[PDB]
PDB file of all heavy atoms in Angstrom:
ATOM      1  N   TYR Z   1     -22.092 -15.269  -9.493  1.00  0.00           N
ATOM      2  CA  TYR Z   1     -23.658 -15.265  -9.716  1.00  0.00           C
ATOM      3  C   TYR Z   1     -24.227 -14.138  -8.872  1.00  0.00           C
ATOM      4  O   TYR Z   1     -23.982 -14.153  -7.502  1.00  0.00           O
ATOM      5  CB  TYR Z   1     -24.236 -16.465  -9.589  1.00  0.00           C
ATOM      6  CG  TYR Z   1     -25.717 -16.403 -10.037  1.00  0.00           C
ATOM      7  CD1 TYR Z   1     -26.058 -16.354 -11.319  1.00  0.00           C
ATOM      8  CD2 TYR Z   1     -26.715 -16.334  -9.004  1.00  0.00           C
ATOM      9  CE1 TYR Z   1     -27.411 -16.301 -11.777  1.00  0.00           C
ATOM     10  CE2 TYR Z   1     -28.104 -16.405  -9.403  1.00  0.00           C
ATOM     11  CZ  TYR Z   1     -28.384 -16.281 -10.806  1.00  0.00           C
ATOM     12  OH  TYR Z   1     -29.746 -16.233 -11.064  1.00  0.00           O
ATOM     13  N   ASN Z   2     -24.932 -13.152  -9.532  1.00  0.00           N
ATOM     14  CA  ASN Z   2     -25.578 -11.940  -8.773  1.00  0.00           C
ATOM     15  C   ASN Z   2     -24.691 -11.283  -7.775  1.00  0.00           C
ATOM     16  O   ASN Z   2     -25.109 -11.086  -6.594  1.00  0.00           O
ATOM     17  CB  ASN Z   2     -26.947 -12.490  -8.139  1.00  0.00           C
ATOM     18  CG  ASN Z   2     -28.122 -12.636  -9.173  1.00  0.00           C
ATOM     19  OD1 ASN Z   2     -27.836 -12.491 -10.376  1.00  0.00           O
ATOM     20  ND2 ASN Z   2     -29.318 -12.769  -8.621  1.00  0.00           N
ATOM     21  N   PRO Z   3     -23.585 -10.818  -8.167  1.00  0.00           N
ATOM     22  CA  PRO Z   3     -22.744  -9.979  -7.336  1.00  0.00           C
ATOM     23  C   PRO Z   3     -23.338  -8.574  -7.085  1.00  0.00           C
ATOM     24  O   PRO Z   3     -24.311  -8.180  -7.868  1.00  0.00           O
ATOM     25  CB  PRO Z   3     -21.521  -9.842  -8.069  1.00  0.00           C
ATOM     26  CG  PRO Z   3     -21.848  -9.781  -9.503  1.00  0.00           C
ATOM     27  CD  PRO Z   3     -23.058 -10.770  -9.544  1.00  0.00           C
ATOM     28  N   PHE Z   4     -22.950  -7.885  -6.174  1.00  0.00           N
ATOM     29  CA  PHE Z   4     -23.391  -6.511  -5.950  1.00  0.00           C
ATOM     30  C   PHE Z   4     -22.208  -5.554  -6.082  1.00  0.00           C
ATOM     31  O   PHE Z   4     -21.066  -6.008  -6.145  1.00  0.00           O
ATOM     32  CB  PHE Z   4     -24.070  -6.308  -4.510  1.00  0.00           C
ATOM     33  CG  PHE Z   4     -25.285  -7.345  -4.281  1.00  0.00           C
ATOM     34  CD1 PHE Z   4     -25.133  -8.449  -3.665  1.00  0.00           C
ATOM     35  CD2 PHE Z   4     -26.453  -6.857  -4.913  1.00  0.00           C
ATOM     36  CE1 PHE Z   4     -26.238  -9.328  -3.585  1.00  0.00           C
ATOM     37  CE2 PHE Z   4     -27.554  -7.827  -4.812  1.00  0.00           C
ATOM     38  CZ  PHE Z   4     -27.414  -9.001  -4.123  1.00  0.00           C
ATOM     39  N   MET Z   5     -22.428  -4.305  -6.205  1.00  0.00           N
ATOM     40  CA  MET Z   5     -21.499  -3.331  -6.390  1.00  0.00           C
ATOM     41  C   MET Z   5     -21.822  -1.934  -6.117  1.00  0.00           C
ATOM     42  O   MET Z   5     -22.984  -1.629  -6.137  1.00  0.00           O
ATOM     43  CB  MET Z   5     -20.839  -3.333  -7.892  1.00  0.00           C
ATOM     44  CG  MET Z   5     -21.872  -3.321  -8.969  1.00  0.00           C
ATOM     45  SD  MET Z   5     -21.393  -4.141 -10.418  1.00  0.00           S
ATOM     46  CE  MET Z   5     -21.449  -5.807  -9.840  1.00  0.00           C
ATOM     47  N   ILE Z   6     -20.876  -1.125  -5.719  1.00  0.00           N
ATOM     48  CA  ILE Z   6     -21.105   0.240  -5.304  1.00  0.00           C
ATOM     49  C   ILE Z   6     -19.818   1.101  -5.854  1.00  0.00           C
ATOM     50  O   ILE Z   6     -18.754   0.659  -5.702  1.00  0.00           O
ATOM     51  CB  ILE Z   6     -21.414   0.481  -3.958  1.00  0.00           C
ATOM     52  CG1 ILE Z   6     -21.977   1.862  -3.584  1.00  0.00           C
ATOM     53  CG2 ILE Z   6     -20.324  -0.111  -2.871  1.00  0.00           C
ATOM     54  CD1 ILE Z   6     -22.470   2.028  -2.069  1.00  0.00           C
ATOM     55  N   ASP Z   7     -20.168   2.177  -6.515  1.00  0.00           N
ATOM     56  CA  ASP Z   7     -19.111   3.204  -7.001  1.00  0.00           C
ATOM     57  C   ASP Z   7     -18.931   4.341  -6.060  1.00  0.00           C
ATOM     58  O   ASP Z   7     -19.913   5.115  -5.937  1.00  0.00           O
ATOM     59  CB  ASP Z   7     -19.506   3.600  -8.416  1.00  0.00           C
ATOM     60  CG  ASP Z   7     -18.355   4.537  -9.049  1.00  0.00           C
ATOM     61  OD1 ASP Z   7     -17.291   4.520  -8.547  1.00  0.00           O
ATOM     62  OD2 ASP Z   7     -18.865   5.319  -9.945  1.00  0.00           O
ATOM     63  N   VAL Z   8     -17.886   4.276  -5.273  1.00  0.00           N
ATOM     64  CA  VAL Z   8     -17.574   5.289  -4.308  1.00  0.00           C
ATOM     65  C   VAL Z   8     -17.383   6.557  -4.984  1.00  0.00           C
ATOM     66  O   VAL Z   8     -17.817   7.657  -4.371  1.00  0.00           O
ATOM     67  CB  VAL Z   8     -16.243   4.940  -3.595  1.00  0.00           C
ATOM     68  CG1 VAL Z   8     -15.857   6.006  -2.628  1.00  0.00           C
ATOM     69  CG2 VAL Z   8     -16.373   3.660  -2.685  1.00  0.00           C
ATOM     70  N   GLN Z   9     -17.027   6.659  -6.146  1.00  0.00           N
ATOM     71  CA  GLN Z   9     -16.910   7.923  -6.871  1.00  0.00           C
ATOM     72  C   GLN Z   9     -18.275   8.655  -7.055  1.00  0.00           C
ATOM     73  O   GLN Z   9     -18.326   9.815  -7.354  1.00  0.00           O
ATOM     74  CB  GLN Z   9     -16.233   7.686  -8.207  1.00  0.00           C
ATOM     75  CG  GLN Z   9     -15.308   8.909  -8.457  1.00  0.00           C
ATOM     76  CD  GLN Z   9     -14.376   8.665  -9.666  1.00  0.00           C
ATOM     77  OE1 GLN Z   9     -14.242   7.754 -10.463  1.00  0.00           O
ATOM     78  NE2 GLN Z   9     -13.549   9.646  -9.899  1.00  0.00           N
ATOM     79  N   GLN Z  10     -19.375   7.866  -6.800  1.00  0.00           N
ATOM     80  CA  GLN Z  10     -20.828   8.623  -6.867  1.00  0.00           C
ATOM     81  C   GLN Z  10     -21.127   9.352  -5.674  1.00  0.00           C
ATOM     82  O   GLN Z  10     -22.177   9.930  -5.693  1.00  0.00           O
ATOM     83  CB  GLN Z  10     -21.872   7.462  -7.083  1.00  0.00           C
ATOM     84  CG  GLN Z  10     -21.840   6.670  -8.414  1.00  0.00           C
ATOM     85  CD  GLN Z  10     -21.738   7.577  -9.533  1.00  0.00           C
ATOM     86  OE1 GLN Z  10     -22.660   8.488  -9.738  1.00  0.00           O
ATOM     87  NE2 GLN Z  10     -20.774   7.445 -10.410  1.00  0.00           N
ATOM     88  N   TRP Z  11     -20.298   9.352  -4.663  1.00  0.00           N
ATOM     89  CA  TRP Z  11     -20.547   9.998  -3.267  1.00  0.00           C
ATOM     90  C   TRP Z  11     -20.166  11.412  -3.327  1.00  0.00           C
ATOM     91  O   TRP Z  11     -20.468  12.064  -2.232  1.00  0.00           O
ATOM     92  CB  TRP Z  11     -19.949   9.192  -2.166  1.00  0.00           C
ATOM     93  CG  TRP Z  11     -20.240   7.707  -2.094  1.00  0.00           C
ATOM     94  CD1 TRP Z  11     -21.249   7.047  -2.768  1.00  0.00           C
ATOM     95  CD2 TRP Z  11     -19.652   6.826  -1.252  1.00  0.00           C
ATOM     96  NE1 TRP Z  11     -21.357   5.819  -2.406  1.00  0.00           N
ATOM     97  CE2 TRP Z  11     -20.305   5.520  -1.427  1.00  0.00           C
ATOM     98  CE3 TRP Z  11     -18.633   6.836  -0.225  1.00  0.00           C
ATOM     99  CZ2 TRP Z  11     -20.018   4.377  -0.767  1.00  0.00           C
ATOM    100  CZ3 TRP Z  11     -18.368   5.581   0.541  1.00  0.00           C
ATOM    101  CH2 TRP Z  11     -19.028   4.453   0.279  1.00  0.00           C
ATOM    102  N   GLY Z  12     -19.594  12.034  -4.361  1.00  0.00           N
ATOM    103  CA  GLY Z  12     -19.202  13.452  -4.352  1.00  0.00           C
ATOM    104  C   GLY Z  12     -17.770  13.642  -3.822  1.00  0.00           C
ATOM    105  O   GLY Z  12     -17.683  14.167  -2.698  1.00  0.00           O
ATOM    106  N   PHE Z  13     -16.772  13.497  -4.624  1.00  0.00           N
ATOM    107  CA  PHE Z  13     -15.409  13.631  -4.227  1.00  0.00           C
ATOM    108  C   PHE Z  13     -14.730  14.589  -5.222  1.00  0.00           C
ATOM    109  O   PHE Z  13     -15.023  14.744  -6.392  1.00  0.00           O
ATOM    110  CB  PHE Z  13     -14.638  12.386  -4.052  1.00  0.00           C
ATOM    111  CG  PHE Z  13     -14.991  11.552  -2.918  1.00  0.00           C
ATOM    112  CD1 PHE Z  13     -15.837  10.382  -3.069  1.00  0.00           C
ATOM    113  CD2 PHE Z  13     -14.435  11.599  -1.750  1.00  0.00           C
ATOM    114  CE1 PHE Z  13     -16.231   9.505  -2.049  1.00  0.00           C
ATOM    115  CE2 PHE Z  13     -14.760  10.739  -0.616  1.00  0.00           C
ATOM    116  CZ  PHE Z  13     -15.578   9.754  -0.798  1.00  0.00           C
ATOM    117  N   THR Z  14     -13.781  15.297  -4.775  1.00  0.00           N
ATOM    118  CA  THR Z  14     -12.941  16.174  -5.532  1.00  0.00           C
ATOM    119  C   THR Z  14     -11.439  15.613  -5.662  1.00  0.00           C
ATOM    120  O   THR Z  14     -10.935  15.230  -4.604  1.00  0.00           O
ATOM    121  CB  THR Z  14     -12.878  17.554  -4.913  1.00  0.00           C
ATOM    122  OG1 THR Z  14     -14.034  18.343  -5.421  1.00  0.00           O
ATOM    123  CG2 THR Z  14     -11.592  18.444  -5.532  1.00  0.00           C
ATOM    124  N   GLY Z  15     -11.003  15.361  -6.850  1.00  0.00           N
ATOM    125  CA  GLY Z  15      -9.730  14.772  -7.102  1.00  0.00           C
ATOM    126  C   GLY Z  15      -9.863  13.176  -7.238  1.00  0.00           C
ATOM    127  O   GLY Z  15     -10.954  12.570  -7.058  1.00  0.00           O
ATOM    128  N   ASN Z  16      -8.627  12.558  -7.434  1.00  0.00           N
ATOM    129  CA  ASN Z  16      -8.542  11.168  -7.681  1.00  0.00           C
ATOM    130  C   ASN Z  16      -8.658  10.287  -6.321  1.00  0.00           C
ATOM    131  O   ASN Z  16      -8.727  10.789  -5.297  1.00  0.00           O
ATOM    132  CB  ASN Z  16      -7.192  10.924  -8.454  1.00  0.00           C
ATOM    133  CG  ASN Z  16      -5.964  11.177  -7.750  1.00  0.00           C
ATOM    134  OD1 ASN Z  16      -5.963  11.592  -6.615  1.00  0.00           O
ATOM    135  ND2 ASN Z  16      -4.803  11.001  -8.360  1.00  0.00           N
ATOM    136  N   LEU Z  17      -8.494   8.977  -6.510  1.00  0.00           N
ATOM    137  CA  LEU Z  17      -8.586   8.096  -5.351  1.00  0.00           C
ATOM    138  C   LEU Z  17      -7.441   8.292  -4.432  1.00  0.00           C
ATOM    139  O   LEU Z  17      -7.774   8.367  -3.171  1.00  0.00           O
ATOM    140  CB  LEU Z  17      -8.568   6.648  -5.913  1.00  0.00           C
ATOM    141  CG  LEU Z  17      -8.321   5.508  -4.887  1.00  0.00           C
ATOM    142  CD1 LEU Z  17      -9.540   5.428  -3.936  1.00  0.00           C
ATOM    143  CD2 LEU Z  17      -8.127   4.091  -5.592  1.00  0.00           C
ATOM    144  N   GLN Z  18      -6.199   8.296  -4.827  1.00  0.00           N
ATOM    145  CA  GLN Z  18      -5.045   8.526  -3.885  1.00  0.00           C
ATOM    146  C   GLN Z  18      -5.090   9.682  -3.045  1.00  0.00           C
ATOM    147  O   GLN Z  18      -4.808   9.596  -1.898  1.00  0.00           O
ATOM    148  CB  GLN Z  18      -3.705   8.476  -4.855  1.00  0.00           C
ATOM    149  CG  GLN Z  18      -2.543   8.986  -3.997  1.00  0.00           C
ATOM    150  CD  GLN Z  18      -1.136   8.217  -4.332  1.00  0.00           C
ATOM    151  OE1 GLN Z  18      -0.864   8.116  -5.477  1.00  0.00           O
ATOM    152  NE2 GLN Z  18      -0.600   7.771  -3.236  1.00  0.00           N
ATOM    153  N   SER Z  19      -5.514  10.902  -3.755  1.00  0.00           N
ATOM    154  CA  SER Z  19      -5.586  12.168  -2.910  1.00  0.00           C
ATOM    155  C   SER Z  19      -6.676  12.105  -1.800  1.00  0.00           C
ATOM    156  O   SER Z  19      -6.519  12.698  -0.813  1.00  0.00           O
ATOM    157  CB  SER Z  19      -5.664  13.415  -3.780  1.00  0.00           C
ATOM    158  OG  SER Z  19      -6.961  13.411  -4.479  1.00  0.00           O
ATOM    159  N   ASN Z  20      -7.771  11.442  -2.041  1.00  0.00           N
ATOM    160  CA  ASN Z  20      -8.804  11.418  -1.139  1.00  0.00           C
ATOM    161  C   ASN Z  20      -8.564  10.381  -0.001  1.00  0.00           C
ATOM    162  O   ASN Z  20      -8.756  10.600   1.210  1.00  0.00           O
ATOM    163  CB  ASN Z  20     -10.181  10.897  -1.832  1.00  0.00           C
ATOM    164  CG  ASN Z  20     -10.789  12.219  -2.426  1.00  0.00           C
ATOM    165  OD1 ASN Z  20     -11.310  13.113  -1.760  1.00  0.00           O
ATOM    166  ND2 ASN Z  20     -10.605  12.313  -3.687  1.00  0.00           N
ATOM    167  N   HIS Z  21      -7.865   9.205  -0.400  1.00  0.00           N
ATOM    168  CA  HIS Z  21      -7.488   8.055   0.443  1.00  0.00           C
ATOM    169  C   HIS Z  21      -6.308   8.604   1.445  1.00  0.00           C
ATOM    170  O   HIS Z  21      -6.501   8.487   2.662  1.00  0.00           O
ATOM    171  CB  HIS Z  21      -7.099   6.894  -0.341  1.00  0.00           C
ATOM    172  CG  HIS Z  21      -6.127   6.025   0.546  1.00  0.00           C
ATOM    173  ND1 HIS Z  21      -4.915   6.183   0.726  1.00  0.00           N
ATOM    174  CD2 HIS Z  21      -6.665   4.805   1.194  1.00  0.00           C
ATOM    175  CE1 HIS Z  21      -4.483   5.070   1.573  1.00  0.00           C
ATOM    176  NE2 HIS Z  21      -5.592   4.271   1.890  1.00  0.00           N
ATOM    177  N   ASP Z  22      -5.355   9.330   0.913  1.00  0.00           N
ATOM    178  CA  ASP Z  22      -4.256   9.845   1.736  1.00  0.00           C
ATOM    179  C   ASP Z  22      -4.627  10.920   2.759  1.00  0.00           C
ATOM    180  O   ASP Z  22      -3.856  11.215   3.525  1.00  0.00           O
ATOM    181  CB  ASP Z  22      -3.090  10.146   0.806  1.00  0.00           C
ATOM    182  CG  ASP Z  22      -2.545   9.113  -0.063  1.00  0.00           C
ATOM    183  OD1 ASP Z  22      -2.849   7.988   0.084  1.00  0.00           O
ATOM    184  OD2 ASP Z  22      -1.533   9.360  -0.717  1.00  0.00           O
ATOM    185  N   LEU Z  23      -5.741  11.467   2.614  1.00  0.00           N
ATOM    186  CA  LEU Z  23      -6.130  12.541   3.605  1.00  0.00           C
ATOM    187  C   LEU Z  23      -6.398  11.960   4.966  1.00  0.00           C
ATOM    188  O   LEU Z  23      -6.220  12.428   6.071  1.00  0.00           O
ATOM    189  CB  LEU Z  23      -7.445  13.171   3.081  1.00  0.00           C
ATOM    190  CG  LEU Z  23      -7.418  14.194   1.974  1.00  0.00           C
ATOM    191  CD1 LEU Z  23      -8.826  14.619   1.569  1.00  0.00           C
ATOM    192  CD2 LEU Z  23      -6.596  15.363   2.443  1.00  0.00           C
ATOM    193  N   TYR Z  24      -6.748  10.515   5.018  1.00  0.00           N
ATOM    194  CA  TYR Z  24      -7.030   9.805   6.156  1.00  0.00           C
ATOM    195  C   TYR Z  24      -6.216   8.613   6.523  1.00  0.00           C
ATOM    196  O   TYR Z  24      -6.282   8.010   7.635  1.00  0.00           O
ATOM    197  CB  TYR Z  24      -8.424   9.240   6.031  1.00  0.00           C
ATOM    198  CG  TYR Z  24      -9.579  10.271   5.517  1.00  0.00           C
ATOM    199  CD1 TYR Z  24     -10.247  10.105   4.388  1.00  0.00           C
ATOM    200  CD2 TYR Z  24      -9.662  11.479   6.169  1.00  0.00           C
ATOM    201  CE1 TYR Z  24     -11.106  11.094   3.865  1.00  0.00           C
ATOM    202  CE2 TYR Z  24     -10.599  12.538   5.650  1.00  0.00           C
ATOM    203  CZ  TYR Z  24     -11.263  12.217   4.548  1.00  0.00           C
ATOM    204  OH  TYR Z  24     -12.181  13.208   4.075  1.00  0.00           O
ATOM    205  N   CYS Z  25      -5.382   8.092   5.551  1.00  0.00           N
ATOM    206  CA  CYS Z  25      -4.668   6.907   5.763  1.00  0.00           C
ATOM    207  C   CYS Z  25      -3.321   6.918   5.199  1.00  0.00           C
ATOM    208  O   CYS Z  25      -3.040   7.286   4.086  1.00  0.00           O
ATOM    209  CB  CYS Z  25      -5.438   5.686   5.207  1.00  0.00           C
ATOM    210  SG  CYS Z  25      -4.703   4.065   5.334  1.00  0.00           S
ATOM    211  N   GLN Z  26      -2.343   6.540   6.060  1.00  0.00           N
ATOM    212  CA  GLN Z  26      -0.928   6.478   5.582  1.00  0.00           C
ATOM    213  C   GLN Z  26      -0.341   5.059   5.582  1.00  0.00           C
ATOM    214  O   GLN Z  26       0.900   4.753   5.303  1.00  0.00           O
ATOM    215  CB  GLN Z  26       0.074   7.291   6.471  1.00  0.00           C
ATOM    216  CG  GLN Z  26      -0.571   8.645   7.011  1.00  0.00           C
ATOM    217  CD  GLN Z  26      -1.153   9.505   5.936  1.00  0.00           C
ATOM    218  OE1 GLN Z  26      -0.539   9.670   4.766  1.00  0.00           O
ATOM    219  NE2 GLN Z  26      -2.231  10.226   6.185  1.00  0.00           N
ATOM    220  N   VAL Z  27      -1.252   3.938   5.905  1.00  0.00           N
ATOM    221  CA  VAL Z  27      -0.711   2.640   5.863  1.00  0.00           C
ATOM    222  C   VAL Z  27      -0.773   1.919   4.472  1.00  0.00           C
ATOM    223  O   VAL Z  27       0.022   1.000   4.297  1.00  0.00           O
ATOM    224  CB  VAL Z  27      -1.550   1.957   6.966  1.00  0.00           C
ATOM    225  CG1 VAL Z  27      -1.499   0.365   6.822  1.00  0.00           C
ATOM    226  CG2 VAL Z  27      -1.134   2.274   8.385  1.00  0.00           C
ATOM    227  N   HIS Z  28      -1.639   2.415   3.612  1.00  0.00           N
ATOM    228  CA  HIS Z  28      -1.696   1.715   2.288  1.00  0.00           C
ATOM    229  C   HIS Z  28      -1.034   2.733   1.292  1.00  0.00           C
ATOM    230  O   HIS Z  28      -1.309   3.793   1.135  1.00  0.00           O
ATOM    231  CB  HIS Z  28      -3.205   1.636   1.866  1.00  0.00           C
ATOM    232  CG  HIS Z  28      -3.998   0.759   2.797  1.00  0.00           C
ATOM    233  ND1 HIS Z  28      -5.089   1.367   3.422  1.00  0.00           N
ATOM    234  CD2 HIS Z  28      -3.725  -0.482   3.145  1.00  0.00           C
ATOM    235  CE1 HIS Z  28      -5.697   0.431   4.183  1.00  0.00           C
ATOM    236  NE2 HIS Z  28      -4.878  -0.726   4.105  1.00  0.00           N
ATOM    237  N   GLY Z  29      -0.038   2.158   0.553  1.00  0.00           N
ATOM    238  CA  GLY Z  29       0.699   2.899  -0.467  1.00  0.00           C
ATOM    239  C   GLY Z  29       0.079   2.718  -1.835  1.00  0.00           C
ATOM    240  O   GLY Z  29      -0.769   1.985  -2.014  1.00  0.00           O
ATOM    241  N   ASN Z  30       0.691   3.522  -2.789  1.00  0.00           N
ATOM    242  CA  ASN Z  30       0.231   3.323  -4.166  1.00  0.00           C
ATOM    243  C   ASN Z  30       1.310   2.720  -5.095  1.00  0.00           C
ATOM    244  O   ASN Z  30       1.919   3.460  -5.922  1.00  0.00           O
ATOM    245  CB  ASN Z  30      -0.278   4.684  -4.732  1.00  0.00           C
ATOM    246  CG  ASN Z  30      -0.971   4.529  -6.183  1.00  0.00           C
ATOM    247  OD1 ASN Z  30      -1.463   3.325  -6.579  1.00  0.00           O
ATOM    248  ND2 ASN Z  30      -1.077   5.600  -6.964  1.00  0.00           N
ATOM    249  N   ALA Z  31       1.626   1.488  -4.872  1.00  0.00           N
ATOM    250  CA  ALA Z  31       2.655   0.861  -5.566  1.00  0.00           C
ATOM    251  C   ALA Z  31       2.520   0.578  -7.116  1.00  0.00           C
ATOM    252  O   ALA Z  31       3.266  -0.100  -7.790  1.00  0.00           O
ATOM    253  CB  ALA Z  31       2.970  -0.476  -4.917  1.00  0.00           C
ATOM    254  N   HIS Z  32       1.326   1.220  -7.703  1.00  0.00           N
ATOM    255  CA  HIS Z  32       1.070   1.108  -9.042  1.00  0.00           C
ATOM    256  C   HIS Z  32       0.742  -0.316  -9.560  1.00  0.00           C
ATOM    257  O   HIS Z  32       1.171  -0.767 -10.620  1.00  0.00           O
ATOM    258  CB  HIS Z  32       2.183   1.724  -9.942  1.00  0.00           C
ATOM    259  CG  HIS Z  32       1.716   3.119 -10.249  1.00  0.00           C
ATOM    260  ND1 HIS Z  32       1.158   4.072  -9.248  1.00  0.00           N
ATOM    261  CD2 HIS Z  32       1.836   3.708 -11.431  1.00  0.00           C
ATOM    262  CE1 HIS Z  32       1.054   5.186 -10.081  1.00  0.00           C
ATOM    263  NE2 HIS Z  32       1.471   5.140 -11.225  1.00  0.00           N
ATOM    264  N   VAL Z  33      -0.043  -1.071  -8.670  1.00  0.00           N
ATOM    265  CA  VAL Z  33      -0.703  -2.297  -9.077  1.00  0.00           C
ATOM    266  C   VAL Z  33      -2.187  -2.142  -8.728  1.00  0.00           C
ATOM    267  O   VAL Z  33      -2.580  -1.305  -7.795  1.00  0.00           O
ATOM    268  CB  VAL Z  33       0.027  -3.664  -8.525  1.00  0.00           C
ATOM    269  CG1 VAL Z  33       1.527  -3.609  -8.829  1.00  0.00           C
ATOM    270  CG2 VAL Z  33      -0.383  -3.836  -7.059  1.00  0.00           C
ATOM    271  N   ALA Z  34      -2.985  -2.906  -9.599  1.00  0.00           N
ATOM    272  CA  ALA Z  34      -4.425  -2.809  -9.293  1.00  0.00           C
ATOM    273  C   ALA Z  34      -4.941  -3.023  -8.047  1.00  0.00           C
ATOM    274  O   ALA Z  34      -5.851  -2.419  -7.493  1.00  0.00           O
ATOM    275  CB  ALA Z  34      -5.199  -3.570 -10.418  1.00  0.00           C
ATOM    276  N   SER Z  35      -4.324  -4.026  -7.275  1.00  0.00           N
ATOM    277  CA  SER Z  35      -4.763  -4.327  -5.977  1.00  0.00           C
ATOM    278  C   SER Z  35      -4.393  -3.150  -4.849  1.00  0.00           C
ATOM    279  O   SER Z  35      -5.236  -3.059  -3.962  1.00  0.00           O
ATOM    280  CB  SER Z  35      -4.008  -5.588  -5.408  1.00  0.00           C
ATOM    281  OG  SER Z  35      -2.602  -5.411  -5.434  1.00  0.00           O
TER     282      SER Z  35
END
């Protein structure tokens, strides 16, 4: 009931999620599951 949400993609990024995330983090991988 009445959840909130924010779309990170609205902040002005170039390229997909993985390429922007991997610029700063090597601990989370992209095992190809939604989580």
Side-chain angles (χ1 to χ4, degrees):
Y1 187 75
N2 281 9
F4 302 98
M5 53 206 72
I6 188 174
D7 179 22
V8 173
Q9 222 168 1
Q10 300 303 307
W11 305 350
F13 288 97
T14 279
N16 68 2
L17 171 63
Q18 162 146 56
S19 73
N20 282 281
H21 163 276
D22 293 359
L23 284 175
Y24 315 120
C25 176
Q26 324 307 323
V27 162
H28 304 120
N30 190 22
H32 265 40
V33 309
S35 61

